[model samples]
Target: CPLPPDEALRQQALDDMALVDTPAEHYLDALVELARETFGVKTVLISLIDHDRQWFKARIGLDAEQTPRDLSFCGHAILASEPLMVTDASRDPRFHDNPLVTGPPFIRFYAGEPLHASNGQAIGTLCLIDPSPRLLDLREGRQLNRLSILAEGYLQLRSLTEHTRFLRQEIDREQRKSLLDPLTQLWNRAGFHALHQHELELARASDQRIGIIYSDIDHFKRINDTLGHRAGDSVLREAASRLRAALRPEDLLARFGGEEFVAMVRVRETTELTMIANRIRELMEATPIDCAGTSVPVTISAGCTLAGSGEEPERALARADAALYDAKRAGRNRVVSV
Candidate 1:
């Protein structure tokens, strides 16, 4: 697949928003549902193209959470400012033999409008798909464009809100600096404690559940012994990035000393929290980290627990820690939820 000329800037813009892997929001869900109803299409999605995959922020009539970028029609759609409309994929040279065209979902018609970030980089698409081939008339095309505008507007506003919240935290310059771990640039243990209480209050106000995950690098000491401290530090930084990427922007993550990291996520259920934890584990094990030209394999074990509405933060932390112990005992590189 051809990449955008401004691929680096585009990716940076997406990362700055930190929307990938975030929980579905009500507004996005409603928007997609409305699109599906208005277009009378089999599927409508707000797809965000990440480094490797196109993850759906809001989806209707799609079972999977994400798909490979190389095979995504939205990947091509994001290249141009105008929508990429395929009246019949079976007759299109570029996608006639594509698996998605031939197999499940069996996309016969597709219309995708490029969705841009606040900086105007096309990050993904607001797309429509149908199993039956059909052409979009001029009137329909205009409607699709307007729908995409709404999607983009919501995304940009959300990005601004998150950015503002981050700025608010940074207002306390000394406290902010002290809360960050120098090595990994993640939040420190004290930072986690401060944020944990804040998150609990938010959860209570929103009547949402909070998931706590305690993760530790598997056999981390072995890496330090074999690869030296410098290499170990490199691994820590890379691991922190992977973990951060796997979490939503609203979620909190902190380096809990040594090889351990803790995350607080606002989720609706224990299963959703477990899914996020599993995503983190998979990301870490997908490839070996490159440390000064040497490929060093890494894996992590995590324990997940849902915090009660009135539960003490310490109690939840301990429960997650105990689950992590179970994961390590059963076998490393897995997640155990309590």
Candidate 2:
């Protein structure tokens, strides 16, 4: 486990990008899938080396989202300028005894191209793995390098296009005080209106589409009547936090009013928006919220839609709301994208 010479700065760079734990994007998924097919490897991963773990931003042929950094070949790959190739892990002193080599996945061959941030810090790798021993030819090595460049460039561009920082600047503390919901500390409805145009402009500038999600807490009235208002309030706060956790940092979240919520995000396609909406719904249903001593099950129904060209923000929201109605009508705890 050799650390980079600029390990502290490297970690800082990785954190600043905020790429870890984000929902998979279509481009990255396609990139990894292409890599897997091109190399004829069992697995292809866009692995980001976090402080103590290597998290996959996009992957194919791997069930797990992340693994311990100490057990990662990408960790060593990040330390080098060129791609690290292990023809046979069993014969390599550095990886022969690694648990990954000895146990499941059973990596016998690896080729990792170190992915660097815009600041020139190696944050992770575009890695290929196989259970069978193999060697990389000169032509294949060049091909891998080119593919890594595409991955790195896309990541850098994504970080650059993130609107979170710009949005922060647009809304100062004074405005935030008025715009934020005191209960959930999320942006309120007024806040959503205030920022909607700016978000749309940003999305247009970045050549991206704006995804709108309308979500409502399932059986919220029943909770208020049965468990009491305090419990209902608790559920609202917990649900808000869960929604926040499920979204990317760049996405906008607001309490629409009552038990409803709204989120806006920049995405490439409708499927990406649907995936994010599903994530919000699934996160809420996965665990029961504990209000005082009582366990309260919570779920959300979400509607998703993409903003049309030259469309009014209100109209997009209305479509999303209509879709949300469809979700509720179909069954609670599901996402309906229109």
Candidate 3:
């Protein structure tokens, strides 16, 4: 017997119920038992279609229960405008290449109805099966079809619930962008200010120390004025990239705005802080950027300062900035500590 399924309508109906291969429902137990007894068959399958595979929610008398959608007879059967049935799978040419029919549990008979949705799309099938060939009784086939209609109600409900939850999470992530840079996707200066203030307080209370590193690209405005704004952008992108690579994972990096970048590294030792600053200076010195297909190598001057007890974050940054000017006076391209 062929199922009267609208390939399009079946998909719509199934998609609406939102019940595809989800967790095995204790609700479906009665339906599976009823179908097996009515058809006197060895197996019955409640299958759902995921993005890649056709996963069976429930089954009776099957050693293995899941298969790829590409290899699924049910995935294709959902297109039927009628019930998808095969009285004898071995004798049928349509199922000769089907993996399920030609292989184990050797499906010789099948009857499935397309589960439809409000929009009438077939998302999955509720099917009955057997190992040996036999004609599906009209009463049994009709009973199976009725069970699918009920299952459709469950599937559509589940899918929409999952879909809505995903969308809400996406919306929340977008709202968090206010404190993040739109360009490099790093923390913005406002975010840094708030966080660094708290960190400075914590260091003071704990008798701990923190280091501030301030660096600005040399000749940045001149680069923009001479090589064009596009080249200047390439230099900034490269600068951020290198800084991120140079700092420790726990350090906070921020784009302190036009042509300046700052870092807050938690280190107590002056020698350790200087080593870190020199590491950044040496890395940028060694790398060359192909600007407008012309090789343009750029360098930066950096300074580091330990935070004084009870100091404001702004004052600590200013101290580091003043030390940075010392690097600029020492002829640019070098790290200077006061």
Candidate 4:
């Protein structure tokens, strides 16, 4: 066996199928059994020619189910669309000195029909081999062609299933990434907006109140100007982590924008909302953030609001934001409720 003229293109076609090393099927294995009996041959195989070797999808009367490209008679078979029949390999110069012929499972005869893809590229073959020299009659040749068509049909089905599965996985991965902040790996602004809308609808039905806490880091611009943007990022991340750890499991935390954070939770009473808002502010003042050898003391100003049943989510955020600015005016590092 030698190289095919369209070797590279044929290899690409084979790879596109994604059908290498898969488990066998009864229907395909059945064809090999039928062909073995019909041709009275020692071996019949559905040989898919790969970059480095030929592998059997279904095989009969063959102990070693795979072989390197140099020893694959199917390599030459795949070169043509028509069947390649060698009545006597011992006489034909192409295979006379081949190892498979001179050694075990001695191959003296071969007849192979090329199997084509939907795109009309020959990817492999339905091949028959015998120990004694013989020829494929007209009837046998016709039967072999039908079997080759069946093999290609299965190849197309398998390839389509795998390709679709891969596409769906990629779409899901991108959607998940879109809803997350790239820096903190926490929910981004868009995700918070969507989830808050859901919570608002639930609160309306249940006659519950949704608590909103809008917080801005105190003197964040000074930190960025004195140290650098990298230090500012470290503080912002540390602040989000601290708030996240202190918040209850049912609460939602998100980064609204630079140096700004938002947290929302459900509360049964105004007092409960005040306690949650104060707890978030307290955690920020409890620790100093370590950023690149500089320990920066951090504090946050927050505005708190309770959205009663039938109140819009945006209206609640606006009130909380107003109180946040009010906290800055009265004094920094404190929570103002509206």
For each candidate in turn, give its C-alpha RMSD to the true structure in angstroms: 12.6, 11.0, 19.9, 21.6
Ranking by TM-score: 2, 1, 4, 3
Report the C-alpha lDDT of model 2 over 84-138, residue by residue, as the tens digit: 9999998998998888899988999999999988889999999889999999999
**Alpha-carbon lDDT of model 4:** 0.76
The better-scoring model by TM-score among 1 and 4 is 1
Candidate 1 error regions (>4 Å) = 162-196, 200-311, 314-338
State how far residue 169 of model 4 sits from its true place (Å): 16
Residue lDDT tens for model 4, 80-198 = 77899999888888887778888877798899999877788888888999999998779989998888888888777766663324423432323433555645435678757645666
lDDT tens digits, residues 1-338, model 3? 13334444554444334343222343455567667787778888777665456756566555343677774667768766588888888888777677778877688888888766557666667887887777767786677777787777755564466332332333232343355553433456864764566556555666667888899898889999989988897787667667776776456777787888888877767888888898888878887865768878899999889877667678889999999999999899988885
Model 4 misplaced stretches (Cα beyond 4 Å): 1-173, 204-207
Report the lDDT of model 3 for residue 332. 94
Q: What's model 2's overall lDDT? A: 0.84
User: Which 10 successive residues of model 1 have the least lDDT summed?
Assistant: 167-176
TM-score of each predicted structure versus truth: 0.55, 0.58, 0.48, 0.49
> Judged by lDDT relative to the true structure, which candidate is superior, 3 or 4?
4
Candidate 2 wrongly placed segments (more than 4 Å): 164-338
lDDT (CA) for every model shown? 0.84, 0.84, 0.69, 0.76
